[PDB]
Amino acid sequence: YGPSPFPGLVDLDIRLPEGQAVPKALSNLAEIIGKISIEESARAMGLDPKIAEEVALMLISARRPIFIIGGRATKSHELVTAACNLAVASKAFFEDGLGVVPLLVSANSLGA
Amino acid sequence: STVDVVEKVKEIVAPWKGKQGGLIPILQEVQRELGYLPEEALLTISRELKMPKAEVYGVATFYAQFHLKPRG
């Protein structure tokens, strides 16, 4: 729910309305591990069925995707897990870990 | 009108989206239907092909056939 930090390289801007979109996202990616329902999991996400449908369609056609999770999502420790679950629901694996790559604001994170 | 050229070049870049090449023919056909390449045309070509503005201006000013100003 931001300014699309790359206005000119993105081809799918999905603006989520606030509230409790975390369970909505986690149930949405639940279908991608099993079936790969969507309408019921795409109401608090503020997306008409079609928008979430082709979101999932582009997410499934990618052989090696990656997710960039920002510091805004840390307003609730639930949305971080939601991103990390969207990572496993699309087989975004690397030999060092998942494709989550969090953006920490300092360097002494574990130290602090 | 600067708003006419937007959609008019949208319809010229349509047959070329996601085809890995063919930018100098796009510029050639925008030169054929306008006599020159305005800044609006180049900006919209860059936004549609998602090719940087520096590249499209470099290739537009590389060839003598093209023109960046209205010709006499």
Added chain:
Amino acid sequence: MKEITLTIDGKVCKGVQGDTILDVANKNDVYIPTLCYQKGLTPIGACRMCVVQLEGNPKMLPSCTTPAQDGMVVVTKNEKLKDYRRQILELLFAGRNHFCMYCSQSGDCELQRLAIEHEMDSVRFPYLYEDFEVDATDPNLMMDHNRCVLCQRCIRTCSEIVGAHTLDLERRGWQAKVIADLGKRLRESDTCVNCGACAQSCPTGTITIREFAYRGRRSECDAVVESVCPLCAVGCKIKTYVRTGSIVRVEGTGVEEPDGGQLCHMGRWWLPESTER
């Protein structure tokens, strides 16, 4: 084999079958004049100062783009090569307007050092006095096209290393120029991140960081210390230059890592601005 050996300047050098001659030369210690070559960028081939010839073959080969092949003898210094390199430098000086007296890089410019090492004391050419634009619209970076060698190392750094493809070449021929987006000034360009990777890549004094002019010369420093940028988590390796108890220049070590040495606006503007608080 993947293990070849050449003879540069009589000195036998070791290398790998995949590299170029300039890489085998730099690998041991051997020196070859270079102006458009930058470690971390694909060889370009523009200045033609790295020319080198073999025994028997009278042709001249660019040591930075020609591969190394076991059994070849390499000659870097002779009368012909000195003459040709001095002619190239004199062309570069007579074409553009080089005023070393007030250049910010007037003691750490690659072109000036190459001119002094070749004993250049005259240009021999009619000194085309052309009018080139000086772009000082951006408060931080200055582009004085009177000092451009057209090595394109700024266009390669903002494209392959940074991604913000803000720079490219304008009209071809002698009228070649390094422009921002759609021929605009740097301040009007929206696709710029103000990283200064172009200022670090420029060998001449065309692109220059403005607020540390005349102070951030690497030749008149007091100490060079390498450390890490504390501001963010990426932790880029730096090459702090200290002069009279003040940081005058922060350069990005790591032209081998995927970052490529490009530091953020903070890493190379706030850190030297912090020592004067």
Added chain:
Amino acid sequence: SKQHRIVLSNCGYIDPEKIEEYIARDGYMALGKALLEMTPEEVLEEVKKSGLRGRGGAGFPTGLKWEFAKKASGDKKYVICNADEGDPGAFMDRSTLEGDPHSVIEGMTIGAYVIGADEGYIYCRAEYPLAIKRLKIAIAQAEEMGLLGDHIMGTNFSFHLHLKEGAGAFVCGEETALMASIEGRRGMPRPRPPFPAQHGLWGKPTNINNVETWANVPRIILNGADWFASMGTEKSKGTKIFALTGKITNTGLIEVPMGITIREIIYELGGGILNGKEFKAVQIGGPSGGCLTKEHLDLPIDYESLTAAGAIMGSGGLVVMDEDTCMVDVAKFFLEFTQRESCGKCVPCREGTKQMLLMLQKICNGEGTMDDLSKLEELAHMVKETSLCGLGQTAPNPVITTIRYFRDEYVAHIKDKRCPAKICP
């Protein structure tokens, strides 16, 4: 007059649009005997002994280039036909694509069969609408008959052509600049050792060739190779299209075998200079080519012989000069062309070409000293030996060749301040 026509053995005794007229004269037979009779290997080795050197100007054995392209990694190849003839005076090649596009289509198809190329491109300037039109309709009229589509002759071989319209530059005729121009970039040449046979269009191997060497692979296949090697001297075997122009009586395109003395070219083929004047010089290789004078009258015209005479073979334009013409002005005109068509990537060309133009302008205008001539000679040699693309290596050709044969005519501009051109103060 009397000349051997191989490439243009169709000219006007054919219909330029309808293909069955063309096939009525052994049109596509070669393709058959190369796609249904021979193997994809012998077709290469029998071309390799035909001695067909690259008619684009270099003079490289096309068999070797085809061997380099065939023995490549990965399964994706290309074949390109360079008709971006930018020399104003080298209409040699547009006339071929306008006369018989189907022979060039045959050549590209044979190349695709030998090398193993799926796709193929042709590069024509948008300034030549006639050739573009005729080729766009000829490829269609040749795939309808099952010669340019999928499963040609039903033999596991497909070959599509995409006619690419060039933008209009002269530097874009080199291999690397052409490859960059197809990919939607600037025609800025790149270093050679990664040749355009291991790494070409989109990284895939390519086999860029000229249109007149493409127009020769069809005939050397059908008429054989021992026959094609019986019209050369000892090294360069075949015919060559020449554009004889300038102050000559008979101007146009001629087709002479290789190893012909230049006298026959200007004294008995064109019939002499276009007045009762005498012959002074002849430029052989278009703008970026040397100029030969009366000491070179019995020297056969080859690839190796012209090089020793400072003149390159490329664009094939033979422009003749009267006795009145001055060689300082000739050099300036042919260098002012190569300056405007320079890329601006290498220092030697971007700078030395402008500087040589200025030196020639001041030597012709009477303001020249005696050491500016030495400066000009050394600058020519430096630009020739240091430049990246062949444009910079052959642009200071009309200065070296005009100084090595007309040195007295230059010194006369420094000492006696008068010019034999009788045109300028």
